[PDB]
Each structure stands twice: as structure tokens, then as C-alpha cells.
Amino acid sequence: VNSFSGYLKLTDNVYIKNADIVEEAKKVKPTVVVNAANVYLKHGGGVAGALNKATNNAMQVESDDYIATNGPLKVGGSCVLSGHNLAKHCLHVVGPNVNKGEDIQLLKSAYENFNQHEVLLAPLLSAGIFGADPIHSLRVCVDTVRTNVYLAVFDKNLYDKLVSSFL
Ligand SMILES: CN(CCC(=O)O)c1ncnc2[nH]ccc12
Numbered sequence: 748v749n750s751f752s753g754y755l756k757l758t759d760n761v762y763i764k765n766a767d768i769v770e771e772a773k774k775v776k777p778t779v780v781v782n783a784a785n786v787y788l789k790h791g792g793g794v795a796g797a798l799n800k801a802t803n804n805a806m807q808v809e810s811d812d813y814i815a816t817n818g819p820l821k822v823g824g825s826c827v828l829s830g831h832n833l834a835k836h837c838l839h840v841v842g843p844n845v846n847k848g849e850d851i852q853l854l855k856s857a858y859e860n861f862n863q864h865e866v867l868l869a870p871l872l873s874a875g876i877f878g879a880d881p882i883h884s885l886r887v888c889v890d891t892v893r894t895n896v897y898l899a900v901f902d903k904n905l906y907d908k909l910v911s912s913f914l
Contacts, residue, residue, distance in 0.1 A: 872888075885913065
């Protein structure tokens with residue numbers, strides 16, 4: 748048993764809810780929250796800017812030190828950093844950004860990072876402002892992630908569309 752509440756069960760291991768991932772993280776304090784990162788860990792908008800703002804910019808300070816030491820992530824890659832006041836850990840995962848021209852086949856590689864963690868609170872990757880079809884992103888998630896994933900879908904109307912269209 749875990750602390751996640753009000754999720755619809757899609758599969759053996761994937762759950763979904765209409766929720767702000769920031770508010771969900773603050774309430775649950777999960778072991779792992781996933782950030783929808785870019786390779787530079789520049790947290791400007793969407794999940795990254797919202798998560799970073801909720802940490803009072805501590806996520807960005809930590810991320811800048813990580814990049815100064817290690818250089819950029821790969822598209823499809825990840826790193827584990829602090830969860831600050833939101834979670835024990837933040838798994839920063841880089842899905843492909845369609846609005847920058849990246850290979851959508853890299854979305855599966857991105858979701859494979861989740862399999863290194865038993866339980867995660869996460870957003871849909873590569874959708875929203877990254878520009879991918881969220882219905883596709885949910886299908887890749889279900890077909891790739893084997894660990895227990897709790898998906899927070901910010902957009903109300905999209906949540907309803909994802910549930911109604913789920914196969
Ligand atoms: C943007 N995005 C993913 C798109 C969606 O889920 O519709 C988010 N996902 C979950 N929580 C969030 N808080 C702020 C944004 C945000």
C-alpha cells in the first residue's frame with residue numbers, strides 16, 4: 748500500500764489522475780517525482796518551471812552545478828537529483844521536444860528511465876509544450892514502464908480525453 752489517492756487504474760502498474768504534479772508532490776512527498784526536463788536542465792515552463800518555482804529556485808541552483816560538472820543530458824536520458832521540498836528525489840527525464848525537431852522514437856528511451864525506480868509520480872513526457880501527442884505519450888508509457896507510475900495530468904480537458912480514448 749502507498750499514499751497516492753484518487754487515481755484511475757489503467758493497467759497493472761499505471762495509474763492516472765487530473766492533478767497538478769506540484770500539488771500532488773507537496774501532498775504525497777513521494778520517493779521520486781519526475782521532471783519533464785531539457786538537456787540543459789533549464790527549468791522555464793510547464794512541469795520544470797512549475798516544479799522549480801515550488802522549490803524557490805533551489806532545483807535550478809542544483810541543476811546548474813550538475814551541468815557545470817557533467818555537461819548536458821542526452822535526449823532520452825535522465826539524472827537523479829534532489830527532490831527538495833517536493834519529494835526525496837527528482838528524476839529529471841528528457842523526452843524529445845517536437846517543437847525543436849527531435850526523434851519521437853526517443854520517447855520510449857525516455858520512459859525506460861522510469862524502470863530504475865519502483866514507484867514514481869510523473870507527468871506525461873513530450874506532450875504539452877514539447878509538442879508530442881499526449882495520447883501517444885500515454886501509450887508509450889503503458890507499453891514501456893513496468894514499475895508503478897502515478898501520472899498527473901494537469902489539463903482537465905486532456906485528462907478526460909486520455910481516459911475516454913485509452914485502449
Ligand atoms: C504541463 N504538464 C504536463 C501536461 C498535462 O498534464 O496536461 C503538467 N503536468 C502535471 N502537472 C503540471 N503542473 C504544471 C504543469 C503540469
